[PDB]
Amino acid sequence: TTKRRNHGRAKPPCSRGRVRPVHCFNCSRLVPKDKSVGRFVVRRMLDQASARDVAEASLIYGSGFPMPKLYMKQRYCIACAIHSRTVRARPVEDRKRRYTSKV
Amino acid sequence: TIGTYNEEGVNVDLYIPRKCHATNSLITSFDHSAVQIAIANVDPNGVIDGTTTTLCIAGYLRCQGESDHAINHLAIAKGIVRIKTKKK
Amino acid sequence: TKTNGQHAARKLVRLRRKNRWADKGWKKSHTFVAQKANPFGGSSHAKGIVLEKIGVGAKQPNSAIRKCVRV
Amino acid sequence: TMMSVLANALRCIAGAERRGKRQVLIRPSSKVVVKFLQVMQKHGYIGEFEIVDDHRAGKIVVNLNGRLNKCGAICPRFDCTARDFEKWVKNILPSRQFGFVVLTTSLGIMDHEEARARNTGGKVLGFFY
Amino acid sequence: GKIRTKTVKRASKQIVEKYFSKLNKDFYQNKRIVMDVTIARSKKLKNKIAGYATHIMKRLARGPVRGISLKLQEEERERRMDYVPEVSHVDQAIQDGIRVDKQTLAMLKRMETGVPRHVLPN
Amino acid sequence: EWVPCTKLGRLVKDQKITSLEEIFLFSMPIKEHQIVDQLIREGDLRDEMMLVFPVQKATSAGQRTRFKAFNVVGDGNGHIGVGARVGKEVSLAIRASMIAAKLSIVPVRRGYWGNKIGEPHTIPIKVTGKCGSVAVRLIPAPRGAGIVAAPVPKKILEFAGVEDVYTSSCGKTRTRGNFIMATFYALRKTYGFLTPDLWAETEVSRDPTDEHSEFLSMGR
Amino acid sequence: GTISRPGGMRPKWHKKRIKRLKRRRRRMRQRSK
Amino acid sequence: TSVSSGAKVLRMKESDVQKLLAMHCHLGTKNSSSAMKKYIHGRTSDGTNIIDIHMTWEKLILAARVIAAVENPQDVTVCSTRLFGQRAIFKFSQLVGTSFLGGRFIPGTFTNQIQKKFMQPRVLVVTDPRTDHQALREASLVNIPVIAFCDTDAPLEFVDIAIPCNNRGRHSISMMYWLLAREVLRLRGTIPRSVPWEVKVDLFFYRD
RNA sequence: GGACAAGUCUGGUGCCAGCACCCGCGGUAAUUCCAGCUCCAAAAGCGUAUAUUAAUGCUGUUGCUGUUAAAGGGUUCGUAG
RNA sequence: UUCUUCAAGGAUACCUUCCUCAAUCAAGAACCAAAGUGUGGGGAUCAAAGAUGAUUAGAGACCAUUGUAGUCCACACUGCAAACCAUGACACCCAUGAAUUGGGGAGUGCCUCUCAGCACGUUUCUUACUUCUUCACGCGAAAGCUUGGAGGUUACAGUCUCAGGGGGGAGUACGUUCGCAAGAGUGAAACUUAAAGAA
Ligand SMILES: [K+]
Ligand SMILES: [K+]
Ligand SMILES: [K+]
Ligand SMILES: [K+]
Ligand SMILES: [K+]
Ligand SMILES: [K+]
Ligand SMILES: [K+]
Ligand SMILES: [K+]
Ligand SMILES: [K+]
Ligand SMILES: [K+]
Ligand SMILES: [Mg+2]
Ligand SMILES: [Mg+2]
Ligand SMILES: [Mg+2]
Ligand SMILES: [Mg+2]
Ligand SMILES: [Mg+2]
Ligand SMILES: [Mg+2]
Ligand SMILES: [Mg+2]
Ligand SMILES: [Mg+2]
Ligand SMILES: [Mg+2]
Ligand SMILES: [Mg+2]
Ligand SMILES: [Mg+2]
Ligand SMILES: [Mg+2]
Ligand SMILES: [Mg+2]
Ligand SMILES: [Mg+2]
Ligand SMILES: [Mg+2]
Ligand SMILES: [Mg+2]
Ligand SMILES: [Mg+2]
Ligand code: NA
Ligand code: NA
Ligand code: NA
Ligand code: NA
Ligand code: NA
Ligand code: NA
């Protein structure tokens, strides 16, 4: 029984033969790049409570200058994406929603 | 001159069926989407006369969404729709 | 579909000859190995001498002794 | 590649009749195609058709009228004797009351009712009903 | 919880429908009326029925209710709503100029009747 | 003690409609089995049980059993109908299938193998009917040859009024449910084929709901 | 779980078992020959 | 529309075009479906489609001749799920005398015969073929023809006569129902052609 | 008992003895074993064993199947055909 | 990754040339991931075998610290993968709506030279990878497929070719060809079982 039409990746037939593998962000397992689950994360270096204290002690960030952020591209194997609740199992007929952009 | 005839003149067929005027196909007895439309004729005055022109649509043509297109051509041929606006 | 030749009878004959060995019924009647392994040399009955009387048990769902002889 | 232009044309026509169209275009056409069409037209099964001329194999535009149910070529063109007409009818026809099997004889291309009258035989070409 | 079941709710709507008059926002007056025009065996149900009827009347005093459907209120709403202005809004619009797009004008010229009056491109 | 619920039922209760051919001509649904009872003599009813087997559905603490029954109803000649229903008891499933069989009734055409002499005896064309894996083919045959068919298609073809036909089959015919319905689908197709004698452009008439619309107007 | 009901142990390890059988048979016939 | 012994009657007049253009009944949406591509006549620089007026009037009269040919007016049912059509549905039924269905369409009103709201209309009129799909699907089971007001993006399955118009905009639907009501009465009834009709389109307008 | 026409009959045995081409029957109320009585088929005929033809579209020219049930060669070039 | 080089390949454009030169294939040929083999280099990382520490009733395993062959290059071998779209190659017909890659035809922004240039907006067209939840008909045991169909098929015929024949024994035994070896290709039977299997 074929569960998915694209077989879980983004490689149509007659398009490619091989895609280079990457390492999982968490368990370091090798997974092809199109099959893996990828998220672009932008996170602050300090939370709201700590940012207030550090801004008060500083002259650079003390008056309306943004604090730096952390930018990373994370790629997951299927097991580590399910276990970390990045993605979830979905009902049949709901497995087709695509969400082309992050919102 | 409808149906099958014996070597004598007796017509042995029962229930000669309807033929759709758009597709020239028999309208069977288990086809529940087949419809009949009656359009009234009128006098030179705007009052209806009392005679109707009748149309037959097959029934699979409706589910395909081509029922509207067929009716336009049928009504044009029958002389009930003016195909193009007249010259000034 | 398959070969449709009007001059391809050789190919169709070879195909049927090769593929006819694949059914166990047809192979058993053209191979001579069955007759050798069969205690009756392809005969309806045969005559023998009784050696001893044995009792063999029945298969699992059943339970009995089937009273055979060794010939 | 394209091996039979008669099998091609008869496949285009039966395809358009299945969908419900009113006209078909057929390429590349040939003498055998035209003579096959004239047999169907003469028995009142297609309607008017016209041949457009390029300085190549032409094209044919055929008008339909909803009477054709199926038409197809027989390949390879087997051989039929004047006593063999029934056997073909029993196989590839819905009934013996209506339908036609088109043959090519030395008199010319013509259906099996005319061929029996002239008491001839030859190679089958196709059928239609 | 204090949810009122379907039996309580349906009877309350029927009472309000038939006897909208004589009803008011006082529970105790409503209870006496309900006891008069009901034949229910249980006293507990009659208390709840009068309770839900007062709640409906309070909502009715503020606005319409989907299930109530009072006859007199409907007629007053219908007469108000079936009002006709002194001059049709379309008539005012035709009296003022009608502005149409250039290709909208293109088909009007091609049409037999031609460009109508009170029509301008922009 | 039957009061009709539809417009067609009201006409049939009176004498406005008298032949099933009038109903079949406009492809209107029946939706009421008393229509067939009145329209047919009822001496030509001829019901027939064909199959009654149990079906099960697993539940917690055991299972649940129901019975499916297939009924075939046909007159002497030209009318056939098949129906299936389910019930908690064998008796209930029998009665329900009888009503369902009468609801779906179709006319089946007939013709001649060769020269046309007397009444028609065989189907006019070869027709196939498919339901699941089971496909049933019917072939016109010369007179005298009986109904060359398995016991199940033969019983159905008797009620339809055919006395002469050749039968070929494919698929898992051991499934009697699919065997019964595959033949019924084959008989329905006899009136869909466009033979060359029906080319014959013919005018259009008016449906009963229009012709007798005045009578249906007043009253309930 | 990805495949359906193997008959008697993982097919890959059954394959490796027979390969070691064929090697031992080859070594045994070389002694005589 | 044409007529045997054609006398140029039943033709679009100057005032009709003024009313149609006044309330923007000739403006489509940005996208179009293949079924409705014939009725479109050109497109603006913005991206809005323009509906050919001549064919809109041609279908409008053709539908009127079908409705007027029914002897019993109760055998015509008018349906609408959109809010903006509910008022026009009511007034249309009042003037012509046709049964009507408004709001949610209960599935089973045409097929469930043992019911207290079972109906058997002889023709059906719907405001929009997309939001009234349940009515169209149900009519496909009991041999009922359908007349619909279609926009440029409408799906035309189970739709027999389509009147290209503007389904959106509160005043647009009211204009079309007003014209259809007037034409039916002119075709048969006590309304003469010469005297303008006395009722007001604002009556057909939907208000809170 | 069913396929398959013909008993919800009466005694005996108690997973034994036995039947059963296949599904199955027999552990104390056996519709299947050993018997009596009825009945069914065909009849001067009727069972059993082995081989073979039809059933078989399960060898397919007419006329099979090959995504997942057995089965498309790893990919190209290429001669006879 | 960039720059410099060498020979190729497809699409498009064309009122260029030629005139059946073609399609598909036993035998035969060339290429073919990883692991593996031979001879020279190279040896940072990771890491079969092996060694320690834990966990455990036991733990030869999973976890931790290491560690040889290998992993990298050149030249010779091997010829197997869930080498998969589990779907052989050539040709015809076949409903819609939004996108995307390359070539060609017919208002806006940048603009001292790989520049009479470069992007974009609107409408057509040939080729390629595909998507529809607002995609047909039709087909299929179903899951599903649908303009590289699994459609146009009991209304069965466009052309060629490779495989199958209830489950096991078994891709095993014997013979033979190829290989340094590991292995590869070809390939049974005696016996045994009423099911195994698909959705
Ligand atoms: K993925
Ligand atoms: K069979
Ligand atoms: K699983
Ligand atoms: K088979
Ligand atoms: K390790
Ligand atoms: K392989
Ligand atoms: K490209
Ligand atoms: K698609
Ligand atoms: K589906
Ligand atoms: K080997
Ligand atoms: Mg490519
Ligand atoms: Mg790969
Ligand atoms: Mg699974
Ligand atoms: Mg498998
Ligand atoms: Mg026997
Ligand atoms: Mg028992
Ligand atoms: Mg045989
Ligand atoms: Mg392949
Ligand atoms: Mg190979
Ligand atoms: Mg980079
Ligand atoms: Mg390597
Ligand atoms: Mg090495
Ligand atoms: Mg080395
Ligand atoms: Mg390490
Ligand atoms: Mg298949
Ligand atoms: Mg075939
Ligand atoms: Mg086998
Ligand atoms: Na046979
Ligand atoms: Na397989
Ligand atoms: Na794959
Ligand atoms: Na394979
Ligand atoms: Na070997
Ligand atoms: Na499963």
Residue numbers in the entry:
A (entry chain AV): 2 to 104
B (entry chain AR): 3 to 90
C (entry chain AS): 2 to 72
D (entry chain AJ): 2 to 130
E (entry chain AL): 2 to 123
F (entry chain AP): 42 to 261
G (entry chain Bz): 2 to 34
H (entry chain AC): 35 to 242
Text of the article:
Trypanosomes are protozoan parasites that cycle between insect and mammalian hosts and are the causative agent of sleeping sickness. Trypanosomes LSU rRNAs are unique compared to those of other eukaryotes, since they are fragmented and composed of two LSU chains and four small rRNA fragments. H69 interacts with the small subunit rRNA helix 44 (h44) just below the A-site, forming the ribosomal inter-subunit bridge (bridge 2a). Ψs on the H69 stabilize the helix, enabling the conformational changes of its loop during the dynamic translation process. H69 harbors five Ψs in close proximity whose location is depicted in the 3D structure of the trypanosomatid ribosome.
Complete knock-out by CRISPR-Cas9 of the snoRNAs guiding Ψs on H69 was lethal, and a single knock-out (sKO) of a specific snoRNA affected growth and the translation of a subset of proteins. This sKO which is specific to Ψ530 affected the ribosome’s structure, resulting in the dislodging of RP eS12 located on the surface of the ribosome. To examine if the ribosome population in the TB11Cs6H1 sKO cells indeed lacks eS12, the structure of T. brucei 80S ribosomes was determined by cryo-EM. Accordingly, 80S ribosomes were purified from PS and TB11Cs6H1 sKO cells, their composition was verified by MS, and the purified ribosomes were subjected to cryo-EM data collection. MS analysis of these purified ribosomes suggested that eS12 was absent in sKO ribosomes. Closer inspection of both PS and sKO models suggested that ribosomes lacking Ψ530 (sKO) have poor and hardly any EM density in the position of eS12, unlike PS ribosomes wherein the entire protein could be modeled. One possible explanation for this phenomenon is that most of the sKO ribosomes lack eS12, while only a small subset of ribosomes might contain eS12, as seen in the MS data. To visualize the structural differences between PS and ribosomes lacking Ψ530 (sKO), we superimposed the two structures and observed very similar global architecture. Minor structural variations were observed in regions distal from the H69, which may result in the reduction of ribosome activity. This is the first structural evidence demonstrating that a lack of a specific RP in mature ribosomes results from the loss of a single Ψ. Note that eS12 is located in the head region of the small subunit ribosome, and its absence can impact the pre-initiation complex and its interaction with protein(s) bound to mRNA 3’ UTR.
